Amino acid sequence: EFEERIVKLKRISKTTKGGRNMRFSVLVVVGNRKGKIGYGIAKALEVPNAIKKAIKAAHNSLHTIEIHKGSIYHEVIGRSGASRVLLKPAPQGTGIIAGGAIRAIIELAGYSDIYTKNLGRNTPINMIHATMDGILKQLSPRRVAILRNKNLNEL
RNA sequence: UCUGAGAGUUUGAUCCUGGCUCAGGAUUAACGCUGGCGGCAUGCCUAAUACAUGCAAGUCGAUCGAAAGUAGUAAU
Numbered sequence: 001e002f003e004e005r006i007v008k009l010k011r012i013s014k015t016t017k018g019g020r021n022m023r024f025s026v027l028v029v030v031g032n033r034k035g036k037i038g039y040g041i042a043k044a045l046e047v048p049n050a051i052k053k054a055i056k057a058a059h060n061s062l063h064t065i066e067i068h069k070g071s072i073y074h075e076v077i078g079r080s081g082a083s084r085v086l087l088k089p090a091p092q093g094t095g096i097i098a099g100g101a102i103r104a105i106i107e108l109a110g111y112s113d114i115y116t117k118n119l120g121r122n123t124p125i126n127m128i129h130a131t132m133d134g135i136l137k138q139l140s141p142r143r144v145a146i147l148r149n150k151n152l153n154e155l
Numbered sequence: 156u157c158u159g160a161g162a163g164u165u166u167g168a169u170c171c172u173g174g175c176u177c178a179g180g181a182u183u184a185a186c187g188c189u190g191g192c193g194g195c196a197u198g199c200c201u202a203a204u205a206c207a208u209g210c211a212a213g214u215c216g217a218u219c220g221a222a223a224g225u226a227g228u229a230a231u
């Protein structure tokens with residue numbers, strides 16, 4: 001049940017020797033709402049073929065996501081170009097306080113409570129890039145234990 | 156135990172810098188349309204401009220002389 005939601009449908013065009021070749025570009029986010037989420041951008045002469053190719057690309061590149069108590073473990077800033085997205089842990093109940101492309105990514109990943117603010121640009125591809133970068137740099141409290149030789153997070 | 160939502164807009168199309176505008180609240184508010192009632196609260200932001208008229212700090216005869224009024228033949 002990998003649900004998918006369009007996050008942007010732009011109208012790109014090149015110029016030839018007379019006229020304008022117009023192709024639709026779609027940005028689809030696919031997520032199983034259990035820890036797997038990917039993004040795919042595709043271009044085609046028509047929306048249906050563009051959507052099919054974008055979903056195919058998105059399903060080809062699926063990253064693995066870990067959730068802690070339904071939220072994000074530690075506050076993180078994802079950077080991608082000039083877009084910086086701040087994610088902050090939230091108590092169980094606030095809901096997803098995100099909006100736009102980031103909100104779509106968080107819902108499709110599985111996370112519930114999440115504090116976000118877009119501190120940079122409003123271009124959907126870079127915000128999604130920043131969101132995925134922020135979520136992928138996250139450190140579990142068990143990897144640092146193997147690293148720092150602590151006691152499975154114990155004080 | 157706190158705790159943050161974005162979008163539109165330069166270009167044939169894209170990214171960035173960057174300004175403008177909008178989605179939310181708020182007031183000692185005014186205007187247009189309309190208009191039934193009740194519980195709370197507010198009500199010259201301007202000319203510290205000029206003001207009719209009527210009210211807004213008096214009280215004690217158990218401090219004191221006198222006066223006045225009513226009863227009383229008078230004293231009282």
Ligand SMILES: [Mg+2]
Nearest residue numbers: 016017018019
């Ligand atoms: Mg020619």
Ligand SMILES: [Mg+2]
Nearest residue numbers: 164165166167
């Ligand atoms: Mg234009």
Ligand SMILES: [Mg+2]
Nearest residue numbers: 177178179180
């Ligand atoms: Mg507004």
